């Protein structure tokens, strides 16, 4: 009556056979799980990656979090800095005492249902001002991955798991994650993040950059409670949230200024947005699918690790996402077309199903590019010059108007040195007549078709 828990998301228990290839497995469950946005994956009983670390030598700078529903929070502070510092031990001592004192109970006697119910009570009650702390950072020397990494001499147990597809360190380089081919720096997106949780520390409603998948592993500790919404209902959810908290939707000039919030799943459910839940326990995986909104909170002291990835399934959505970013004037993490062309240029060493799928996206790219160039020629842009867009830092090749990262082409004018617009915004560069403009382009149409043909040959 005050909190009605959403229905449970799918839970999968793959055999060692199914578990052997994560991408094949994820492809298998996709028809089911994309309907719920998140799913939980239980590895085979004996898949037990060894965790070991010194709780006194691992330190991190804590982030502070107020717990008020609908209140604005900023997504990531990928740079911590800070003066406050916990070791894993001192944070754990703080975390356990907090939970223990909050409920006046020992921590594993506090029922998960109760913590959940209480969480939604405290975030909605205005004069409760509970604040908590948490850790969130990419792997570093002061704090590294929870999975085995090859360096230091390792035990045969760690060696068995060193190359596992489910070892999340391996997805920044695994063959069928399209992100692995990106030569551009996308560190904040490609490397695993480490999260140290405590009771009620939470992650606001969000979707991944470029609508990528994510996969989260809870190494140890108390559970992590999740809420998930399927990709098809993304705009539904956004409409509900814009109505209840429009501040979050004002434009901001950074990827370092994305605004997000806590919001009761019952609110979404009242507005007919489908929402699912799960308690992720130690040793379990949660997977989020493209454009699946998700949020949640930790039940107590714990340690999780997560990473983004992109399968070939995702390529058309990646293209749609950047188009969606353009309409919103949202910054890109990388150029999707640049990634496509990078892959085309490596067609011979590409996996063959990958090659086939890249070829299809490239064909759309080329077709759209052809049409755009015809339009800008008709606007009176005549001069042109080839330009190696991939050499420019990102902040020197964003469209003035829509902020998209240019790669296929842009318009410049000697009137405004260094400024560029994409071909959707030829009118937005300056007041000079179009005959003063240059079309800057990475490839001629004639360069492009042979690149696509290499993919076709590789794929047959
Ligand atoms: Mn409150
Ligand atoms: Mn996420
Ligand atoms: Mn516009
Ligand atoms: Zn533009
Ligand atoms: Zn000009």
């Amino acid at each position: 009556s005050m909190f009605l828990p959403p229905p449970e998301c799918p839970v999968f228990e793959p055999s060692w056979e199914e578990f052997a290839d994560p991408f094949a497995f994820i492809h298998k469950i996709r028809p089911i799980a994309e309907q719920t946005g998140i799913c939980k994956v239980r590895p085979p009983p004996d898949w037990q990656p060894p965790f070991a670390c010194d709780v006194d030598k691992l330190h991190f700078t804590p982030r502070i979090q107020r717990l008020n529903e609908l209140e604005a929070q900023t997504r990531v502070k990928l740079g911590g800095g800070g003066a406050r510092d916990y070791t894993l031990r001192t944070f754990g001592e703080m975390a356990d005492a907090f939970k223990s004192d909050y409920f006046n109970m020992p921590v594993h006697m506090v029922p998960t249902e109760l913590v959940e119910k209480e969480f939604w009570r405290l975030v909605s009650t205005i004069e409760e001002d509970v604040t908590v702390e948490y850790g969130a950072d990419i792997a570093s020397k002061e704090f590294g991955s929870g999975f085995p990494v090859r360096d230091i001499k390792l035990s045969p147990e760690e060696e068995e798991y060193l190359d596992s597809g489910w070892n999340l360190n391996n997805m920044p380089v695994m063959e069928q994650s399209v992100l692995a081919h990106i030569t551009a720096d996308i560190c904040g997106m490609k490397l695993p993040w480490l999260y140290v949780g405590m009771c009620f520390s939470s992650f606001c409603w969000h979707i991944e950059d470029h609508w990528s998948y994510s996969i989260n592993y809870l190494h140890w500790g108390e559970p992590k409670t999740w809420y998930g919404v399927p990709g098809y209902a993304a705009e539904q959810l956004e409409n509900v949230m814009k109505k209840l908290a429009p501040e979050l939707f004002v434009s901001q000039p950074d990827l370092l200024h994305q605004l997000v919030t806590i919001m009761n799943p019952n609110t979404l459910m009242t507005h007919e947005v489908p929402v699912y839940r799960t308690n992720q326990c130690a040793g379990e995986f949660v997977i989020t699918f493209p454009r699946a909104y998700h949020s949640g909170f930790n039940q107590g002291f714990n340690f999780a690790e997560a990473v983004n990835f992109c399968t070939v399934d995702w390529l058309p959505l990646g293209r749609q996402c950047v188009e969606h970013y353009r309409l919103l004037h949202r910054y890109c993490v990388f150029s999707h077309d640049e990634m496509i062309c990078k892959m085309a240029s490596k067609a011979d060493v590409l996996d063959v199903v990958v090659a086939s799928t890249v070829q299809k996206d490239m064909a759309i790219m080329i077709e759209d590019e052809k049409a755009l160039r015809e339009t800008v020629r008709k606007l009176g842009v005549i001069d042109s010059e080839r330009m190696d867009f991939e050499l420019l830092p990102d902040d020197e090749r964003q469209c003035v108007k829509c902020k998209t990262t240019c790669f296929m082409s842009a318009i410049s004018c000697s009137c405004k040195p260094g400024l560029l617009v994409c071909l959707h915004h030829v009118k937005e560069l300056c007041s000079c007549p179009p005959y003063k403009y240059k079309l800057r382009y990475r490839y001629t149409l004639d360069d492009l078709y042979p690149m696509m043909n290499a993919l076709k040959l590789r794929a047959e």
Side-chain angles (χ1 to χ4, degrees), residues 73 92 233 242 277 300 359 434:
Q73 310 186 37
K242 174 136 35 64
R277 77 172 304 289
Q359 171 189 354

Side-chain angles (χ1 to χ4, degrees), residues 145 345 401:
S145 172
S345 82
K401 182 63 167 183

Side-chain angles (χ1 to χ4, degrees), residues 136-140 143-174 176-204:
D137 262 305
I138 57 187
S140 72
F143 214 111
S145 172
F147 295 98
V149 290
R150 197 182 293 101
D151 262 37
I152 269 164
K153 188 63 183 200
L154 282 75
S155 50
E157 61 186 23
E158 289 168 300
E159 288 174 5
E160 301 154 9
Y161 297 98
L162 264 170
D163 308 292
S164 173
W166 299 85
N167 181 322
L168 292 195
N169 284 103
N170 291 333
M171 297 229 198
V173 298
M174 264 202 108
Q176 325 102 308
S177 187
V178 183
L179 293 184
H181 289 114
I182 290 181
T183 184
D185 168 78
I186 50 177
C187 268
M189 160 154 197
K190 173 190 288 193
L191 298 183
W193 289 63
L194 307 164
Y195 302 98
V196 181
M198 66 174 285
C199 193
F200 305 140
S201 72
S202 56
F203 46 110
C204 298

Side-chain angles (χ1 to χ4, degrees), residues 67-68 122-123 125 128:
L67 299 175
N68 303 311
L122 71 91
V123 298
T125 305
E128 299 260 23

Side-chain angles (χ1 to χ4, degrees), residues 37 41 71 90 199 248 253 255 281 284 333:
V41 176
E71 184 176 289
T90 60
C199 193
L248 314 177
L255 291 172
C281 299
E284 290 171 358
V333 178

Side-chain angles (χ1 to χ4, degrees), residues 412-416 429-433 436-437:
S412 62
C413 180
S414 57
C415 146
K416 284 181 165 84
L429 179 59
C430 68
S431 43
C432 293
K436 303 257 278 268
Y437 295 174

